[PDB]
Amino acid sequence: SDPAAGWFWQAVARQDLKSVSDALDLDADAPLSATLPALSVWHRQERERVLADGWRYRVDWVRVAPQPVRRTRETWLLVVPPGGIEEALVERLTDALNTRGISTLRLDVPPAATSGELATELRAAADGDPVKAILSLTALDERPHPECKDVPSGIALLLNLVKALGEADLRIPLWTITRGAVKAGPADRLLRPMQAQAWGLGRVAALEHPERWGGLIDLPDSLDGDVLTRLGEALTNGLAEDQLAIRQSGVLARRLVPAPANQPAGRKWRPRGSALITGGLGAVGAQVARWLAEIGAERIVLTSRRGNQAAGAAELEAELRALGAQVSIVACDVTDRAEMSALLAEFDVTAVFHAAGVGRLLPLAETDQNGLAEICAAKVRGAQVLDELCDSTDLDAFVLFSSGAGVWGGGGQGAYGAANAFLDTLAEQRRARGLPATSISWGSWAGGGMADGAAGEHLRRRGIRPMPAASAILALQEVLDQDETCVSIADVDWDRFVPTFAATRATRLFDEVPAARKAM
Amino acid sequence: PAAGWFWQAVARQDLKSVSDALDLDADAPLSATLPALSVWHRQERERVLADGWRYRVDWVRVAPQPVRRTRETWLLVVPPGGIEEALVERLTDALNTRGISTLRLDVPPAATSGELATELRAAADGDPVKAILSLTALDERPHPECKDVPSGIALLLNLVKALGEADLRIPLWTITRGAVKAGPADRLLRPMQAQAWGLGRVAALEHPERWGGLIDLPDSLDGDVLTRLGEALTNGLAEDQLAIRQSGVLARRLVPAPANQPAGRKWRPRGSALITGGLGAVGAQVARWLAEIGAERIVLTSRRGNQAAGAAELEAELRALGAQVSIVACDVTDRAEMSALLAEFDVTAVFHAAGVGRLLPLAETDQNGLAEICAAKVRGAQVLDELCDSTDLDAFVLFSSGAGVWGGGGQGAYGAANAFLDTLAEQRRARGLPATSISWGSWAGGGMADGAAGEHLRRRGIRPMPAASAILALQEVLDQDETCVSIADVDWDRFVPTFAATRATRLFDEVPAARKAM
Numbered sequence A: 001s002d003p004a005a006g007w008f009w010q011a012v013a014r015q016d017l018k019s020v021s022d023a024l025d026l027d028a029d030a031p032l033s034a035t036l037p038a039l040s041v042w043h044r045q046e047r048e049r050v051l052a053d054g055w056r057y058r059v060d061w062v063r064v065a066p067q068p069v070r071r072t073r074e075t076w077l078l079v080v081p082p083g084g085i086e087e088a089l090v091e092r093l094t095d096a097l098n099t100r101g102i103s104t105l106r107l108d109v110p111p112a113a114t115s116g117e118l119a120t121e122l123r124a125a126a127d128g129d130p131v132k133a134i135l136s137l138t139a140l141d142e143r144p145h146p147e148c149k150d151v152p153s154g155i156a157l158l159l160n161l162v163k164a165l166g167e168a169d170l171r172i173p174l175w176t177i178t179r180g181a182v183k184a185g186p187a188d189r190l191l192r193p194m195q196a197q198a199w200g201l202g203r204v205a206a207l208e209h210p211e212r213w214g215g216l217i218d219l220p221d222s223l224d225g226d227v228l229t230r231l232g233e234a235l236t237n238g239l240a241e242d243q244l245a246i247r248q249s250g251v252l253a254r255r256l257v258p259a260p261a262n263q264p265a266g267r268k269w270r271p272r273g274s275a276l277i278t279g280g281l282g283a284v285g286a287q288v289a290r291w292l293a294e295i296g297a298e299r300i301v302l303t304s305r306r307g308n309q310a311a312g313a314a315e316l317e318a319e320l321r322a323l324g325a326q327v328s329i330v331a332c333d334v335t336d337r338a339e340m341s342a343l344l345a346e347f348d349v350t351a352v353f354h355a356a357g358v359g360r361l362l363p364l365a366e367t368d369q370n371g372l373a374e375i376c377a378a379k380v381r382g383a384q385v386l387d388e389l390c391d392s393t394d395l396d397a398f399v400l401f402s403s404g405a406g407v408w409g410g411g412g413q414g415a416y417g418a419a420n421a422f423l424d425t426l427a428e429q430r431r432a433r434g435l436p437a438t439s440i441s442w443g444s445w446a447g448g449g450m451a452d453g454a455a456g457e458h459l460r461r462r463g464i465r466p467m468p469a470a471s472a473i474l475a476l477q478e479v480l481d482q483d484e485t486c487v488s489i490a491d492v493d494w495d496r497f498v499p500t501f502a503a504t505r506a507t508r509l510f511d512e513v514p515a516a517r518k519a520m
Numbered sequence B: 001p002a003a004g005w006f007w008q009a010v011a012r013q014d015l016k017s018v019s020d021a022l023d024l025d026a027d028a029p030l031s032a033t034l035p036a037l038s039v040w041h042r043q044e045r046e047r048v049l050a051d052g053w054r055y056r057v058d059w060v061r062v063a064p065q066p067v068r069r070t071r072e073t074w075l076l077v078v079p080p081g082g083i084e085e086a087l088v089e090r091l092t093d094a095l096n097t098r099g100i101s102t103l104r105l106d107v108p109p110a111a112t113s114g115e116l117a118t119e120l121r122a123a124a125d126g127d128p129v130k131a132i133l134s135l136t137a138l139d140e141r142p143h144p145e146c147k148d149v150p151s152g153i154a155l156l157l158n159l160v161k162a163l164g165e166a167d168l169r170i171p172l173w174t175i176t177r178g179a180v181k182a183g184p185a186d187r188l189l190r191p192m193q194a195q196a197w198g199l200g201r202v203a204a205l206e207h208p209e210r211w212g213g214l215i216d217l218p219d220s221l222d223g224d225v226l227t228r229l230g231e232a233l234t235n236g237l238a239e240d241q242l243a244i245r246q247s248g249v250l251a252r253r254l255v256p257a258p259a260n261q262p263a264g265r266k267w268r269p270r271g272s273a274l275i276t277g278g279l280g281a282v283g284a285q286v287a288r289w290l291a292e293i294g295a296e297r298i299v300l301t302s303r304r305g306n307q308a309a310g311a312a313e314l315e316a317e318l319r320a321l322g323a324q325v326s327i328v329a330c331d332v333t334d335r336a337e338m339s340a341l342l343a344e345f346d347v348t349a350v351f352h353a354a355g356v357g358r359l360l361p362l363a364e365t366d367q368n369g370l371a372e373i374c375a376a377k378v379r380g381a382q383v384l385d386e387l388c389d390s391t392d393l394d395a396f397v398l399f400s401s402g403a404g405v406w407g408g409g410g411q412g413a414y415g416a417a418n419a420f421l422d423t424l425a426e427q428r429r430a431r432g433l434p435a436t437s438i439s440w441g442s443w444a445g446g447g448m449a450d451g452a453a454g455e456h457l458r459r460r461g462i463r464p465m466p467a468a469s470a471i472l473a474l475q476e477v478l479d480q481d482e483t484c485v486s487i488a489d490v491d492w493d494r495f496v497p498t499f500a501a502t503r504a505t506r507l508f509d510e511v512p513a514a515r516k517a518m
């Protein structure tokens, strides 16, 4: 009933001054009169902290048992984007699909192909020979198109490819290959966040058009030995794994795993100097701001395109100043490198919180390259800009506000899932460079903001329970204290979530969440 | 529970209470606050534990269903004193109504197990004797050459042994009348007869073979009470501990007795408190507790008096908690001396802890042993009961044992003596005088559960209670103004299998723990 009070009395017996005085934020010599107040606060907070512990999840990778060899010869269409890919790689893949039955039919995509044009190429290849599946390589094409700077050209291509299979009425599994979009074990250092976008989108493609969608596979850095053979068997798995990574140690499948925090944490995180929240005048940024003020940030810099013009801006400066912090509210687009650069240097910021972003529910079929740009630009490109600046092990915190939409997905959330899966890989890439980064993909928050709409209705109806802001904050604190990289923090009603989520499409994604097992 | 208090005290936000519960000031560092918390919490915890040491005896309505029997012969054993021929005649007729035929043995006074064996030998060849029904426990008057010991109980014993020397292996059923209190307004209460239950419960364990059970008849034999008597003797469902009342047949059950707040009053002495056997182990603790809660004075008595180990040492502690102390050489069984003591010290609160403890199989037991074990405990209580005729007296407390409630191997005499105490207290209550009987499991420390004897009870499932918490329980019982309560820490999973080792029992069916050990 009360594990907090449990642990307290278990510390009281045991006589752990160290644990208790840490817990209460007090010195061994503190008077009872300071001790009592600190107790009631710890008590309210510990009970919410224990609640929030059960909201944590991480992404693991589990070994998938080899089960080949098998089958007779099929034709696959191999789709190759205009950039990002070495001929030597196409040949090695082609040659390894051949040595396992799969005959290859190569389609080369022109730059900025439309869904109309691709459906034509698909219609032609479909009639020619008997195509069983499509192996798309287009996600390796990271460069933006110059017309549309904020979208990687291969992700524009994936999109138009999912739509083109529709326009063509083509009912044929699409498989999406990436190299470095996931971290599947310690030792992965090829991390390519623009390619993670394929995974964020792909999970949604899988829900919206299960019939069009084979799966996602991540190739390793080193393609020596047998990895390319394992590719061939991965494409045929018949275990219905649809999120795979191929490594030195074989084929690995993506799982979501409860990640309860094993105590204690190795620090109590506090901002030193200035803290920056981009999108700091939104619902979530306002909370993050109140928290920083409460825990003694000397200055909070809040940015947004509207800046001081933003509804609530003057309320919020008042509240923050009433808690003793200095406040700077600036109008600044995240995507503007010079303005952000001047900004960081002027205030000497020591902690960055990236909350700039837009939410919109929009089916993949209704999404185009501009919509994708509209949704991604501040989140993704604001994250690169921040990453480029901040070339610095000194920073206390480089915290990205991501979403469950980017970790497991949901209908309507192609572009948003893409933008969010980028951040999780960006955070991993940064760590691999020796920099700090933290990416937290939230379930919805109570209060205003992105989960407040009829949108909040949709998400409640899918079995995501909004988290009280104060408990969300407590969980952020915890992540920061724990010095974590990626962790997902959501209050999910598994009874209701799973049946909705797995209506159209089976998934092994949640096999390791007990409450999710129960729910069919 | 405590905790729930603490957390709201903490919640918002009160130094005063928290500061008071822990002996320390608003200024105290956290490194003193910790230890103080652990000690508060540990005390509060032990309070809960000592709450779960409580049991009482209830009596459950059990209509016997087994009619079904046929016809046979019982021996019916009748003492010299305490029986109306009218009674013997009602019982003979009821036993004959239900198929049982009746052979009457009148037993000479002071009959030895030897003499008894003979007549039993004679009865057993002359007739196919199926059971034996003793009425001897009715004979309450003391043994001819043995003031300290009721005739009927010396007979019962000698009877148990007698079956021994004639290896008859036929069951003995013992009838009492008013030995037990089976519901409110049972007012015929006969402590000498209760001794039969204490010994009997032990006889059942030491000689299952030889033991039928115990049945208590009511005041008035009208309506069906004589009918039901026949039923109870041939119910056999075990059930060997039985009362018969206007409202049916009742079986004896041991039942957890959690304190059911509030606690009516907060008890303290108003004058001199006397503890008989006050220089024994338990005497010393209780005395420390009294002296602790503000007794003007404390009289400790004992045959040894001042020449007992702990002599002045004990007194020093007491004087030094701020008490007056009179250690007197006094024999509780001595009426004259005891009268003088209570007048002399205007004593308004009594705690009877004089007793004697040994483990002794029934077969090694005789009148003299029965007298050594009982004299102080029983005649002591009697003497204290005779004096102390005032409702003014705040306490009247009897230090009894679980050996008298459920029994154990080797504690026949001891069980008899304690059983006497429980019933006595009920009798005083019935007469409008205060009285309290607590039947303790074993205490940690010196005294009766100290030596080999503590080890013995250890193996049997009795966990010795820290003196300090036994005191917690005592205090509660007085505050609660209760009459009879058992207080013991029983490790049931060990207790049940060794207790019910040779003989089944229904006595614990109402203890949740006890049932998960069969």
Ligand SMILES: NC(=O)C1=CN([C@@H]2O[C@H](COP(=O)(O)OP(=O)(O)OC[C@H]3O[C@@H](n4cnc5c(N)ncnc54)[C@H](OP(=O)(O)O)[C@@H]3O)[C@@H](O)[C@H]2O)C=CC1
Binding pocket: A278, A279, A280, A281, A282, A283, A284, A285, A303, A304, A305, A306, A307, A310, A332, A333, A334, A335, A354, A355, A356, A357, A358, A377, A378, A379, A382, A401, A402, A403, A404, A441, A442, A443, A444, A445, A446, A448, A449, A450, A451
């Ligand atoms: N609310 C929730 O439950 C969840 C939110 N999140 C994430 O948390 C973040 C905050 O969401 P929430 O607070 O709910 O949303 P809000 O819509 O309230 O705030 C987001 C803010 O981002 C700012 N922004 C947009 N574009 C830019 C830009 N180009 N440069 C700088 N700032 C910009 C916007 O302000 P302006 O227009 O003035 O520039 C807006 O105020 C979002 O990134 C969202 O992805 C994640 C999971 C759940």
Ligand SMILES: NC(=O)C1=CN([C@@H]2O[C@H](COP(=O)(O)OP(=O)(O)OC[C@H]3O[C@@H](n4cnc5c(N)ncnc54)[C@H](OP(=O)(O)O)[C@@H]3O)[C@@H](O)[C@H]2O)C=CC1
Binding pocket: B276, B277, B278, B279, B280, B281, B282, B283, B301, B302, B303, B304, B305, B308, B330, B331, B332, B333, B352, B353, B354, B355, B356, B357, B375, B376, B377, B399, B400, B401, B402, B439, B440, B441, B442, B443, B444, B446, B447, B448, B449, B450
């Ligand atoms: N120890 C335990 O755990 C339990 C104890 N009890 C009861 O508590 C009581 C005492 O226990 P405890 O203190 O452990 O045992 P002790 O032997 O320590 O104390 C018994 C004391 O009674 C005194 N006594 C014996 N005979 C007489 C007499 N004729 N007149 C006056 N005093 C006498 C003895 O003093 P002296 O020898 O100097 O005459 C002796 O000090 C007993 O009734 C026992 O039945 C009950 C249940 C459990």
